[PDB]
Design a protein around this ligand. Structure first.
Ligand SMILES: CC(C)C[C@H](NP(=O)(O)O[C@@H]1O[C@@H](C)[C@H](O)[C@@H](O)[C@H]1O)C(=O)N[C@@H](Cc1c[nH]c2ccccc12)C(=O)O
Ligand SMILES: CC(C)C[C@H](NP(=O)(O)O[C@@H]1O[C@@H](C)[C@H](O)[C@@H](O)[C@H]1O)C(=O)N[C@@H](Cc1c[nH]c2ccccc12)C(=O)O
Ligand SMILES: *[C@@H]1O[C@H](CO)[C@@H](O)[C@H](O)[C@H]1NC(C)=O
Ligand SMILES: *[C@@H]1O[C@H](CO)[C@@H](O)[C@H](O)[C@H]1NC(C)=O
Ligand SMILES: *[C@@H]1O[C@H](CO)[C@@H](O)[C@H](O)[C@H]1NC(C)=O
Ligand SMILES: *[C@@H]1O[C@H](CO)[C@@H](O)[C@H](O)[C@H]1NC(C)=O
Ligand SMILES: *[C@@H]1O[C@H](CO)[C@@H](O)[C@H](O)[C@H]1NC(C)=O
Ligand SMILES: *[C@@H]1O[C@H](CO)[C@@H](O)[C@H](O)[C@H]1NC(C)=O
Ligand SMILES: [Zn+2]
Ligand SMILES: [Zn+2]
Lengths: 697, 697
C-alpha cells in the first residue's frame, strides 16, 4: 500500500498530527496550520518568559544530566568525580542557607568593598583605590567587566592569533533601552534600584551597621544615574553590525593618546590598567602593544561622564555589578531579593528547580566532562556519519546554487566557493572527551571542589575560566578546540574559525533521527545545517574569508548587489506586525542576518531533499496524515519552530532580538518559497504566497 | 492487511509505544514493561510529592479552566460572570499583597481572637468565652471543625433523611502518626510549631505588640502538647473501617448523659452547643434529638484531656486550626510562612502557578458553573451514550458473574443482583447545568463577589457552603443531586445513594474515546466502571443495601466467606515490599477495599471485552505494536496507572493510604488474572503468574 507502519513512523506521525491544526488553511497561515495544536496544549511555565520546542528538548536534556550527575559510580575518572562533586555542592541548600551571606562578606575586601555597605570607605579603601586597580581586579580575578570591557580574543584580521580588545561594557539591565526608565521600563528601573537597596540593607544588617533608608536610596539612585549615563554612551546594535567598521587596531600608547580618561581628578593610565590585568597571568605589556578598540566613540563619550563621579560613586556601581550576579549563590534572603527583581523584569513568579539550575551550571563550567556523560547516556555516536553525509550534501547544494545566482560576478562566486569548501564541521562531540581520560582529567587539574563550599567553588570557576582566557594572548588559536559543549540544544557558526557546529543536543527529534523519514530530517536538521552554513555568507559573515580573516573578498558590484538583495528582506520583515508586542513592527535590520540564514537554509535543505529523491525515489508515506513527503518536509520545518512568548517579553524583545519571532521565521521564509506554494497548491497572492519573493542565497 | 492506519490509531499506538519499556519481560514485571518508558521521561515537579497520569490530565484540565475563566464574554449568564469575577479576585496578587494581613485581623474578634497574638485575652474575651460558643462559631460560620466534629449528613440507616453526626476532628498534621514526633516526623513536628510561632509573630508585628520569642514558643509548644493528646485519643482507621460498628444512634440527652465534658472547671452542655450551631440556620434542637456518634471512644477519652487545659490553651489551638488554612489567602509574608511548613512536610520547593490554584479554587466552590464551561469547551456530550452502553455491559457482566461465585449462597446472590440493578449511574455532567440558566443562576444567588476583595470572597464561600449543609437537616436527600462536579479527573461510588459517577474529566484518553480501540476503552474506562461498581460490594459497601441503607443483607455464611476470600488479598498485598518506602510492607487491611475494587473491576472489564468480541469480532490491529487486542487491553489498563512517588511521600503514605501504590495496583491485579498470563504466555510461577490467585468478585 506504500505506507510505512513501523514504530518510528507511527511516533513521527503522532507528533506531526498532535502539533498541527488541520482546520486551518496552510496557504492562509502556515504557523497556525503547523503549530495550532502545539499552542492549544502548551502554556508558558511560571519560570519562563517564553516557551517553544527548544525549551522542551532543553528540559528533557536536563533530566538526562540529573540522571548522569546524581549517582557516583565506581569506574568514574577524576574529571567525572569533580563534575558530580560540583553538582552535589550546588544542590545542598541546607549547607548554602547555613553560611548566610558570610562568603560574600569575606570576598568583599578583595574587590575594594562596596561603599554603601562599608563604614568609613574613604579611610579604609579610598587611600589605595585607583580605577586602574579596581576595574582590573574585577576583570582578572572574577572575569567581571565594568566601565571598560578589556578582553583577550581572536584578532578578526589574523585568526591564528589572540589580541587584547577594548569594548563597551554590558549593563545591569537587559539593554540600553531600559535606561529611558519610562513606559514599559518604569517598573524594571524602580525594581532595579529597589534590588540594589535590598542587597545593601541585607549586608549592613549582617555586619550590624546602622540602616538609614534615605541614605541607601540616595547612594543607589546615584548608581542608576551613573549607569543611565554609561548606557546612553554605549553604541546601538545597528552601529555595531558591520565588522569592517567595528575593527580599529591601534597601539596602547595611541589608545593612551586619543582615549584619555580622568577618574578622581587624576588622569587614567592605560598601561598600568593593562599590566594590572596581564600580571595575573605573568604577561608583560609594552607601551607599544596592538589593541583592537571596538568602541572608540564610547571611550570618547566616557571621559566627560567619569570626571563627574567620585571613587565612592564608581565603586558603588562596580561592586554592585559583581554582587548582583553572586546573590543567587547565597542564602534564602539573598536569593529572595533577586527573585523579586526577576519577577519585575520577566513577569515570572517562580525560579527553575534547583537541580535543573545546578545541572546547567555544571554543564556550562565543565562542558567536556558533562558532554562525555551526556553522549554516553543519550547520543548514538554512529549517527555522526549520517549527519556527516547530510552536511556534505548541503555544502554541495550551496556551491551548485552559486551558479544560479544572477547578482554575483564569476570572480565573487569563485571566492564564495573557496570559503564554502574551507568550512570545517563539528558533529556531536569531540571524540577525545570519551577516548582521552588524561586530556579530560588535565583540563580540570587546577580545580578542587569541596562539597560543602558552593560559593568557594563558583569563585574558583570564575578564576579558572578567566586565567585560561588571559593566558591565550601570546598563544596561537587552537584548531581542534570546540566552540560548544556536546550537551547543548543549539547550532552555531564561527566566522573567526569558519566553522559550523552541531552539538549532540540538537541531533535528536524533531530535527534528526537515522530512523525518521528523510523529508523530516532535511526539513529539520537539513535546514539547521543550511542556516549555519548561510551564516558564513550573511551581512556579518560575508566579511570573513575562507581562513576566518576579516578581509574584503567581494567586488564593489557583488557587495552592492548583496545589500540590494538583502533590502527586500529588511522591508519584508520590517513590515511584519507582532500581535504579542501590541502590533509593533519587527526590526528588519536587527534580524537581517538570521532572516538571510533562515531563507538561505530552508532553500538549500529542500534542494538537497529533491536531489535525495532523484537518486533514491519516493519514501513510503506516513500513516494517518493525508500529506506527501514534499508537504511533510515543510510541516516538520515549521514544527521545529513551534513556540510562543509572554506579551511583556515581546514588547521588549522586538527592539533587540536578532532572530525573528518563531511565527515570522516560518511565515517570512515560506512567503519567499515558490516550492512551498507548489507543495501546498497556494493560489497567487494568498497570504503565504505573495507575488514578490526576496532572495539572497 | 488487517491493520488500522487512522489518525486515531496512530495517536493511540504512539502513546502506548512511548510509555512502555519493550526491553522488559512482561511476565517478570508488567509495571516496568507497561510504564518503563513513562518513568524514564517523567520527573516529579517541585510542586508535587508524586506524579502520574492523574496529574497529567489534571494539569491539562486546568489549562482548559484558565481558557474558559480568563476571558469575559458578552453572552455570559450571571452564574458564569460570578465564577470569572471570583477567578479575577484570586489571580490579583497586587490587590492581595496590598491588604497585608488586615482581613485576618478584622475576622479575628468574630472567632474569639487568637490568645497568643492578643493582649489581655482573658479580660477582652475570656469573660463571654464558652467552649460551646467558640467551637460553634468556628463550625457554623466558617465550617471549621475543632475538638468536636459536628456535622449534618445522610443517616446511614435511612438514606432519605439527614441527621446530626458527631465524630473525631481532623488534625493539623496529615495523620495521627505524625504526633509521635520522632524519626520521619521530627522535622514536620518542629516545622509545625515553627509555623505557629511564625504566624503568631507576623500578627503581633502588624498589631504593633511586644514580641517575646520565649513566650511564643511556650504558648505554641502547649498547642502541640494539646493536639498530641487529641491525636492519641482519635481512633485508628482500622478501628473505623466497619460501618455497622461505627454507627451509634442516640438522643442528645443520652449524649449529654454518657459523654459528659468539663471545660474550664464548668461542665459542657451538648444542647447549648447544638443550638448555638443550629440557630445559624433557624433550626430548633430538642433535648430529644437523635444524633449518630461515630467516635464514642474519642468523646470518652476527650474528658480527662480537656479538664487539663485553660480557655487560653484551647482557643490558641482552635484559632490556629482556622488561621493555618487562611494564611495562603493573605499577603507574601503570610504565604511565605506556609510555604516553609509545606516544604518541611512534602519536600516541595515551589507552589503551583497562582492561575492553577485559582482555577481549582473556583472549580471547587462553583462546580456547576465551572462544569458547564468545561463541558462546552472540552467534552463531546454525544459520548455520554457510548459510556451509558459500557456501564450497561459491565453491570450485566457483574450480575452474570454472581452465578459463577462458589462462596455465596443463592439467597445472597439474589440480594446482590437487587443491589446491582438499583445502582444509578451519573455520566459526564448534569444536563441541567447547560440547559437551565435560572436553576444555575439561583444556586449562586446569595453570592456577591468583589474583584478587589479575595479574602471577603473566600469567607463568603465558607459561610454559604456551611449554611447550605446545616439547612439540609430537616430536608430530604435530593435524588437528582450529583456528588461531583464535571471538571474532575476521578470516578466515585456513593454507598448512601448507591450510585457510580463518571465526571467528564475522566471520560478522555487513555481511559476513553469513542474513536479509540475498544480494547483500550474496556482496559481503561471499562476497568474504572467495574472498580466503582465493585465498591458497592467491598468490605465497606457490601454493608449497604439497594436503597443505600446500612442493613445486613448477607447470610451469616456468605459474609464469613466474604472475609475468607478477602483474607487472601490482605496477605497478598501485605506481603508486597515498597522500594520507595524503604522496602516497608503495604498495609493489606487499609488498602483491602481498593484492592477488591481493582481486582473485581479488571475481571468484569475483560469479560465484557470478550463478550464484545463474541458479538462483533476482532478489531483491526494497531500499527507499530507487535501485540494483539487481548494484550493491548492489559497494556492500556497498566498505562492508566503509570506513576511515581517521592521517597519521603512513600515512607509516610504507606501507613495511611487506602489505595495501593500504582505499581502494586498493576502487579497485584494481574498476579490474580489467569487471562493476563494467557494473553502474555506467562510460565507458571513467573513473577506475574503465581500459582495461587485471590478472588472476591
Ligand atoms: C537553526 C537553529 C536551531 C540554531 C540557530 N543558532 P544560531 O542563530 O547560529 O546562533 C544563535 O544565535 C546567535 C545570534 C548567537 O550568536 C549564538 O550564540 C546562538 O545563540 C538559532 O536560530 N538559534 C536560536 C533559537 C534556538 C536555539 N536552540 C533551539 C532549539 C530549538 C529551536 C530553536 C532554537 C537562538 O539561539 O536563540
Ligand atoms: C479507578 C480510578 C480512576 C478512580 C478511583 N476512585 P475511587 O477509589 O472510587 O474514590 C477515590 O478514593 C476514595 C477512597 C475516596 O473516598 C474518593 O473520594 C476518591 O478519592 C481511584 O482509584 N482514585 C484514586 C486515584 C486516581 C484519581 N484520579 C485518577 C486519575 C487517573 C489515575 C488515577 C486516579 C484516588 O482518588 O486517589
Ligand atoms: C548537606 O550539607 C551538610 C553540611 O556539611 C552535610 O552535613 C550533609 O551531609 C549534606 N547533605 C547531602 C545530601 O550531601
Ligand atoms: C600600577 O600603578 C599603581 C598606582 O597606584 C602602582 O601602585 C602599581 O604597583 C602598578 N602596578 C602594575 C602591576 O604595573
Ligand atoms: C514595508 O514595505 C515597503 C516596501 O514595500 C518599504 O518601502 C517600507 O520601508 C517597509 N516598512 C518598514 C516599516 O520596514
Ligand atoms: C489589581 O487590583 C487593583 C486594586 O483594585 C486594580 O487597580 C487593578 O485593576 C487589578 N488588576 C487586574 C488585572 O484586574
Ligand atoms: C447557650 O448558652 C450560653 C451560656 O453562656 C448563653 O449565653 C446563650 O445565649 C445560649 N445560646 C443558645 C443559642 O441557646
Ligand atoms: C504474607 O503471606 C502469608 C500467606 O502466605 C500470610 O500468612 C502473612 O500473614 C503475610 N504477611 C503480611 C506481612 O501480611
Ligand atoms: Zn542564526
Ligand atoms: Zn476505589
Amino acid at each position: 500500500d506504500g505506507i510505512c507502519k513501523s514504530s518510528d513512523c507511527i511516533k513521527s506521525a503522532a507528533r506531526l498530527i498532535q502539533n498541527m491544526d488541520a482546520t486551518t488553511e496552510p496557504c492562509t497561515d502556515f504557523f497556525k496550520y503547523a503549530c495550532g495544536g502545539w499552542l492549544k496544549r502548551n502554556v508558558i511555565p511560571e519560570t519562563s518568559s517564553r516557551y517553544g520546542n527548544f525549551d522542551i528538548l532543553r528540559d528533557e536534556l536536563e533530566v538526562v544530566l540529573k540522571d548522569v550527575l546524581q549517582e557516583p559510580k565506581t569506574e568514574d575518572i577524576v574529571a567525572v568525580q569533580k563534575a558530580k562533586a560540583l553538582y552535589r555542592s550546588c544542590i545542598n541548600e541546607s549547607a548554602i542557607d547555613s553560611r548566610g551571606g558570610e562568603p560574600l562578606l569575606k570576598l568583599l575586601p578583595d574587590i575594594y568593598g562596596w561603599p554603601v555597605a562599608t563604614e568609613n570607605w574613604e579611610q579604609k579603601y579610598g587611600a589605595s583605590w585607583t580605577a586602574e586597580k579596581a576595574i582590573a581586579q574585577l576583570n582578572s580575578k572574577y572575569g567581571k567587566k565594568v566601565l571598560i570591557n578589556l578582553f583577550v580574543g581572536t584578532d578578526d584580521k589574523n585568526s591564528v592569533n589572540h589580541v587584547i580588545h577594548i569594548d563597551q561594557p554590558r549593563l545591569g539591565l537587559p539593554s540600553r533601552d531600559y535606561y529611558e526608565c519610562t513606559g514599559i521600563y518604569k517598573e524594571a528601573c524602580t525594581a532595579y534600584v529597589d534590588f540594589m537597596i535590598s542587597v545593601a540593607r541585607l549586608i549592613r544588617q549582617e555586619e550590624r551597621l546602622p540602616i538609614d533608608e534615605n541614605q541607601l536610596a540616595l547612594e543607589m539612585n546615584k548608581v542608576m544615574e551613573l549607569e543611565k549615563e554609561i548606557a546612553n554612551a554605549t553604541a546601538k546594535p545597528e552601529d555595531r553590525n558591520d565588522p569592517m567598521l567595528l575593527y580599529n587596531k591601534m597601539t596602547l600608547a595611541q589608545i593612551q593618546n586619543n582615549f584619555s580618561l580622568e577618574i578622581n581628578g587624576k588622569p587614567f593610565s592605560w598601561l598600568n590598567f593593562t599590566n594590572e590585568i596581564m600580571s595575573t597571568v605573568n604577561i608583560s605589556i609594552t607601551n607599544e602593544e596592538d589593541v583592537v578598540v571596538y568602541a572608540p566613540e564610547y571611550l570618547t563619550k566616557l571621559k566627560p561622564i567619569l570626571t563627574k563621579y567620585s571613587a565612592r560613586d564608581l565603586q558603588n556601581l562596580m561592586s554592585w555589578r559583581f554582587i548582583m550576579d553572586l546573590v543567587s549563590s547565597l542564602s534564602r534572603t539573598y536569593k529572595e531579593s533577586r527573585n523579586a527583581f526577576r519577577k519585575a523584569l520577566y513577569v515570572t513568579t517562580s525560579e527553575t528547580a534547583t537541580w535543573r539550575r545546578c545541572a546547567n551550571y555544571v554543564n556550562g563550567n565543565m562542558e567536556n566532562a558533562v558532554g562525555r556523560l551526556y553522549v554516553e547516556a543519550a547520543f548514538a555516536g554512529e549517527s555522526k556519519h549520517v549527519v556527516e553525509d547530510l552536511i556534505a550534501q548541503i555544502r554541495e547544494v550551496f556551491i551548485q546554487t552559486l551558479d544560479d545566482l544572477t547578482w554575483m560576478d564569476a570572480e565573487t562566486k569563485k571566492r564564495a566557493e573557496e570559503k564554502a569548501l574551507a568550512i570545517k564541521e563539528r558533529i556531536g562531540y569531540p571524540d577525545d572527551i570519551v577516548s582521552n581520560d588524561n586530556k579530560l582529567n588535565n583540563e580540570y587539574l587546577e580545580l578542587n571542589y569541596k562539597e560543602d563550599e558552593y560559593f568557594e567553588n563558583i569563585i574558583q570557576n570564575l578564576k579558572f575560566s578567566q586565567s585560561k582566557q588571559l593566558k591565550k594572548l601570546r598563544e596561537k588559536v587552537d584548531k581542534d578546540e570546540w566552540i560548544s559543549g556536546a550537551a547543548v540544544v543549539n547550532a552555531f557558526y564561527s566566522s573567526g574559525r569558519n566553522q559550523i557546529v552541531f552539538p549532540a543536543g540538537i541531533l535528536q527529534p524533531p530535527f534528526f533521527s537515522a530512523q525518521q523519514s528523510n523529508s523530516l530530517n532535511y526539513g529539520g536538521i537539513g535546514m539547521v545545517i543550511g542556516h549555519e552554513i548561510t551564516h558564513g555568507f550573511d551581512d556579518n559573515g560575508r566579511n570573513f574569508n575562507k581562513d576566518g580573516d576579516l578581509v574584503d573578498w567581494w567586488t564593489q558590484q557583488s557587495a552592492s548587489n548583496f545589500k540590494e538583495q538583502s533590502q527586500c528582506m529588511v522591508y519584508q520583515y520590517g513590515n511584519f506586525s507582532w500581535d504579542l508586542a501590541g502590533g509593533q513592527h519587527l526590526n528588519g535590520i536587527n534580524t537581517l542576518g538570521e532572516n538571510i540564514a533562515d531563507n538561505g537554509g530552508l532553500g538549500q535543505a529542500y534542494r538537497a531533499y529533491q536531489n535525495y529523491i532523484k537518486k533514491n525515489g519516493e519514501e513510503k508515506l506516513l500513516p494517518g496524515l493525508d500529506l506527501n513527503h514534499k508537504q511533510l518536509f515543510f510541516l516538520n520545518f515549521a514544527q521545529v519552530w513551534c513556540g510562543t512568548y509572554r506579551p511583556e517579553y515581546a514588547v521588549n524583545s522586538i527592539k533587540t532580538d536578532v532572530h525573528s519571532p518563531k511565527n515570522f521565521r516560518i511565515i517570512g521564509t515560506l512567503q519567499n518559497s515558490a516550492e512551498f506554494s507548489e507543495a501546498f497548491h497556494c493560489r497567487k497572492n494568498s497570504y503565504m504566497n505573495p507575488e514578490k519573493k526576496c532572495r539572497v542565497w
